[PDB]
Write an enzyme that holds these catalytic residues in place. Structure first.
Site, PDB file in Angstrom:
ATOM      1  N   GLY A  45       0.794  -1.218   0.000  1.00 29.92           N
ATOM      2  CA  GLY A  45       0.000   0.000   0.000  1.00 29.92           C
ATOM      3  C   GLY A  45       0.823   1.263   0.000  1.00 29.92           C
ATOM      4  O   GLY A  45       2.008   1.241  -0.334  1.00 29.92           O
ATOM      5  N   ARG A  46       0.181   2.369   0.335  1.00 27.94           N
ATOM      6  CA  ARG A  46       0.825   3.660   0.403  1.00 27.94           C
ATOM      7  C   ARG A  46       0.261   4.629   1.469  1.00 27.94           C
ATOM      8  O   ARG A  46      -0.872   4.544   1.857  1.00 27.94           O
ATOM      9  CB  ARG A  46       0.846   4.321  -0.974  1.00 27.94           C
ATOM     10  N   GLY A  47       1.096   5.547   1.922  1.00 28.84           N
ATOM     11  CA  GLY A  47       0.764   6.606   2.866  1.00 28.84           C
ATOM     12  C   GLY A  47       0.882   7.944   2.166  1.00 28.84           C
ATOM     13  O   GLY A  47       1.130   7.983   0.953  1.00 28.84           O
ATOM     14  N   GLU A  51       5.478   4.555   0.313  1.00 29.19           N
ATOM     15  CA  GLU A  51       5.125   3.411  -0.530  1.00 29.19           C
ATOM     16  C   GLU A  51       5.584   2.180   0.247  1.00 29.19           C
ATOM     17  O   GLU A  51       6.750   2.113   0.662  1.00 29.19           O
ATOM     18  CB  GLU A  51       5.808   3.491  -1.901  1.00 29.19           C
ATOM     19  N   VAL A  52       4.653   1.243   0.522  1.00 30.51           N
ATOM     20  CA  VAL A  52       4.960   0.105   1.381  1.00 30.51           C
ATOM     21  C   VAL A  52       5.029  -1.235   0.696  1.00 30.51           C
ATOM     22  O   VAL A  52       4.211  -1.543  -0.169  1.00 30.51           O
ATOM     23  CB  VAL A  52       4.154   0.113   2.706  1.00 30.51           C
ATOM     24  N   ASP A 155      -2.433   8.831  15.309  1.00 32.60           N
ATOM     25  CA  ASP A 155      -3.102   8.243  14.141  1.00 32.60           C
ATOM     26  C   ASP A 155      -3.632   6.814  14.401  1.00 32.60           C
ATOM     27  O   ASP A 155      -3.487   5.912  13.567  1.00 32.60           O
ATOM     28  CB  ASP A 155      -2.245   8.374  12.863  1.00 32.60           C
TER      29      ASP A 155
HETATM   30  C1  LIG Z   1       4.451   0.590   7.172  1.00 24.46           C
HETATM   31  C2  LIG Z   1       3.573   1.646   7.780  1.00 24.46           C
HETATM   32  O1  LIG Z   1       4.032   2.384   8.636  1.00 24.46           O
HETATM   33  N1  LIG Z   1       2.249   1.724   7.373  1.00 24.46           N
HETATM   34  C3  LIG Z   1       1.633   1.025   6.328  1.00 24.46           C
HETATM   35  C4  LIG Z   1       1.483  -0.338   6.486  1.00 24.46           C
HETATM   36  C5  LIG Z   1       0.918  -1.122   5.504  1.00 24.46           C
HETATM   37  N2  LIG Z   1       0.754  -2.513   5.623  1.00 24.46           N
HETATM   38  C6  LIG Z   1       1.390  -3.354   6.519  1.00 24.46           C
HETATM   39  C7  LIG Z   1       0.992  -4.774   6.350  1.00 24.46           C
HETATM   40  C8  LIG Z   1       1.548  -5.668   7.176  1.00 24.46           C
HETATM   41  N3  LIG Z   1       1.298  -7.026   7.178  1.00 24.46           N
HETATM   42  C9  LIG Z   1       0.615  -7.676   6.203  1.00 24.46           C
HETATM   43  C10 LIG Z   1      -0.667  -7.400   5.773  1.00 24.46           C
HETATM   44  N4  LIG Z   1      -0.879  -8.318   4.792  1.00 24.46           N
HETATM   45  C11 LIG Z   1      -2.081  -8.450   4.010  1.00 24.46           C
HETATM   46  C12 LIG Z   1       0.231  -9.102   4.671  1.00 24.46           C
HETATM   47  N5  LIG Z   1       1.160  -8.730   5.523  1.00 24.46           N
HETATM   48  N6  LIG Z   1       2.429  -5.230   8.125  1.00 24.46           N
HETATM   49  N7  LIG Z   1       3.082  -5.981   9.029  1.00 24.46           N
HETATM   50  C13 LIG Z   1       3.828  -5.143   9.750  1.00 24.46           C
HETATM   51  C14 LIG Z   1       3.655  -3.820   9.300  1.00 24.46           C
HETATM   52  C15 LIG Z   1       4.289  -2.647   9.790  1.00 24.46           C
HETATM   53  N8  LIG Z   1       4.818  -1.697  10.192  1.00 24.46           N
HETATM   54  C16 LIG Z   1       2.767  -3.906   8.251  1.00 24.46           C
HETATM   55  N9  LIG Z   1       2.239  -2.968   7.432  1.00 24.46           N
HETATM   56  C17 LIG Z   1       0.458  -0.492   4.363  1.00 24.46           C
HETATM   57  C18 LIG Z   1       0.572   0.880   4.212  1.00 24.46           C
HETATM   58  C19 LIG Z   1       1.160   1.659   5.187  1.00 24.46           C
HETATM   59  C20 LIG Z   1       1.279   3.135   4.944  1.00 24.46           C
END
Ligand SMILES: CC(=O)Nc1cc(Nc2cc(Nc3cn(C)cn3)n3ncc(C#N)c3n2)ccc1C
Ligand SMILES: [Cl-]
EC number: 2.7.11.1
Length: 329
Positions: A45-47, A51-52, A155
């Site tokens: 996903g994204r913030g 970009e994650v 948040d």
């Molecule tokens: C990284 C962050 O700050 N924000 C964020 C986070 C995500 N998404 C996930 C999904 C999973 N896990 C996951 C979900 N799925 C279906 C598979 N595996 N995790 N795990 C640990 C973490 C952390 N930290 C994290 N984050 C998307 C978008 C955003 C912006």
């Protein structure tokens, strides 16, 4: 005129009493690692400025979450690092595994522990009366911890709550908006998701504290026990306070703004009007009766308050009869 000053009821002078290195994040020196040690697997996903990706640590094959920090100020990058490092080993708080930069683009990235999350939209539907009290106590351990450590998450929302239901494991994530509490500081109200924003953010009262996260938690609780996500569903920031007011009533909203001498944004004074308080029992129907109890409704009523100084602290929230027998302690 002039807003009335406010101080946090707990953990007030907690940062004033620690060295600069702790909270003066701009002066913190970062030793950047290498992103080449990580193999990206898929996009998560994204913030607003991120970009994650789900990635793999090449050396040990462990699953990891990589957050690429898209054009942001290095001031905010260092703040997120400092908050995460200060909170490491904290209960139900996501662990920062590494701090890296791409070898070619030199773009910074934060590496986190991986949680096998079930999307809240499919998960909450499945939760029992016990599950919700369990997960709520876990969010509170994370909030009492960071509040005791001088950090406001800012948040708290279902998307920032990673839950591995099978393992009954919860992690509070995205400390990208988190801030250090400083007595008498005026914070940016353009924080949090629309639906979980505290009235202090909506009415633009800048001298808020830890109690902001408490409001958002109450929002998360309402959607769960009543089966209505989001509970307060505004189409904008003005309509958000209108939705809240239609439930909590205007009597207390006006007493709040009068108490702290809040000058409401003028657009408010045309749409707010007068609403009677809607009792929590009105949201209780046949399909969610199994999640509802007098203590759930009492707990909720003690979090969902306009006056930030009147909401339960995370410690008091944990001592509530709602959590009796849920955990040991
Ligand atoms: C990284 C962050 O700050 N924000 C964020 C986070 C995500 N998404 C996930 C999904 C999973 N896990 C996951 C979900 N799925 C279906 C598979 N595996 N995790 N795990 C640990 C973490 C952390 N930290 C994290 N984050 C998307 C978008 C955003 C912006
Ligand atoms: Cl900010």
């Amino acid at each position: 005129s002039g807003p009335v000053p406010s101080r946090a009821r707990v953990y007030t002078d907690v940062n004033t009493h620690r060295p600069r290195e702790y909270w003066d994040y701009e002066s913190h020196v970062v030793e950047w690692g290498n992103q080449d040690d990580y193999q990206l697997v898929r996009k998560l996903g994204r913030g607003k400025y991120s970009e994650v990706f789900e990635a793999i640590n090449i050396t040990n094959n462990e699953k990891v979450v990589v957050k690429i920090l898209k054009p942001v100020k290095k001031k905010k990058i260092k703040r997120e690092i400092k908050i995460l490092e200060n909170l490491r080993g904290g209960p139900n708080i996501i662990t920062l595994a590494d701090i890296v930069k791409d070898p070619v683009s030199r773009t910074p990235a934060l590496v986190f522990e991986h949680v096998n999350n079930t999307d809240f939209k499919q998960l909450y539907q499945t939760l029992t009366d016990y599950d919700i009290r369990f997960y709520m106590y876990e969010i509170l351990k994370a909030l009492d911890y960071c509040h005791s450590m001088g950090i406001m998450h800012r948040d708290v929302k279902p998307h920032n709550v990673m839950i591995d239901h099978e393992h009954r494991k919860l992690r509070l994530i995205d400390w990208g908006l988190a801030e250090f509490y400083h007595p008498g500081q005026e914070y940016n109200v353009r924080v949090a998701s629309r639906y979980f924003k505290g009235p202090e953010l909506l009415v633009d009262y800048q001298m808020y504290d830890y109690s902001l996260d408490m409001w958002s938690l109450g929002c998360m609780l309402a959607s769960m026990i009543f089966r209505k996500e989001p509970f307060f569903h505004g189409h904008d920031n003005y309509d958000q306070l209108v939705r809240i007011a239609k439930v909590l009533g205007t009597e207390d909203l006006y007493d709040y703004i009068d108490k702290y001498n809040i000058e409401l944004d003028p657009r408010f004074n045309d749409i707010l009007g007068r609403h009677s308080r809607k009792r929590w029992e009105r949201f209780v129907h046949s399909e969610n009766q199994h999640l509802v109890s007098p203590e759930a409704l009492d707990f909720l009523d003690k979090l969902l308050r306009y006056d930030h100084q009147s909401r339960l602290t995370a410690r008091e929230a944990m001592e509530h009869p709602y959590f009796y027998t849920v955990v040991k302690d």
